[PDB]
Amino acid sequence: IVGGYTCGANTVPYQVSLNSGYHFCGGSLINSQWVVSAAHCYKSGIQVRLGEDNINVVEGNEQFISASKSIVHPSYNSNTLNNDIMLIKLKSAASLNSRVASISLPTSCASAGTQCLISGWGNTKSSGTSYPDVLKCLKAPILSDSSCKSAYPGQITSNMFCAGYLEGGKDSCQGDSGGPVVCSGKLQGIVSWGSGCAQKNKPGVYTKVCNYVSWIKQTIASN
Numbered sequence: 001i002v003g004g005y006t007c008g009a010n011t012v013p014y015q016v017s018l019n020s021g022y023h024f025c026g027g028s029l030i031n032s033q034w035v036v037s038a039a040h041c042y043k044s045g046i047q048v049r050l051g052e053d054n055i056n057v058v059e060g061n062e063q064f065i066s067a068s069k070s071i072v073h074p075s076y077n078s079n080t081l082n083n084d085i086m087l088i089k090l091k092s093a094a095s096l097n098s099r100v101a102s103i104s105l106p107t108s109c110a111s112a113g114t115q116c117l118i119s120g121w122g123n124t125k126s127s128g129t130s131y132p133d134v135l136k137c138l139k140a141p142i143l144s145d146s147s148c149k150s151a152y153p154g155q156i157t158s159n160m161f162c163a164g165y166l167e168g169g170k171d172s173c174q175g176d177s178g179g180p181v182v183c184s185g186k187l188q189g190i191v192s193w194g195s196g197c198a199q200k201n202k203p204g205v206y207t208k209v210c211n212y213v214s215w216i217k218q219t220i221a222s223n
């Protein structure tokens, strides 16, 4: 997250870190056994880390649980990032409490101008590289369809939306991928892609979660 702020320990209790001997992506806990992330974060050997703030210090509150299933959307396209969504089943159920909690799925899609919360342990620099210890947060609005498409001609599908700031300086970034965009208590977005990060006129592009609610529920119910 570039241009964000320190969330504070366990203030985003649905935020998870996907770990493969190192933090590589975020995710969102949607029930005690299931995490939503990005398809482009897929790999085998995923360990899900819940209840994290400082990802480099064992603070108390952590639960480390291996992924038993990692399910990429069947129509995921790795060139366009259309359908950039993955469901991870946990080997055992997480223990839910104030510091480890699920986030609700949308009942409808959010609107342009709606303010959301984006979070992760990704790069904090628009030019170089700096990875934080603690979880970073950013408040960002959903942009209009047309603005998003003007920013990224021919690349925005109906399963994507733009959020953030056209002036530069405030965005998600590498290492935030798969993490949450929460608006009015609902998981509306997944950190997906963008041109660089926090670059002028290149806002963040997010997987549009409201299109996948039925797919999520059926996939969960079948597995």
Ligand SMILES: [Ca+2]
Pocket: 052, 053, 054, 055, 056, 057, 058, 059, 060, 062
């Ligand atoms: Ca920790």
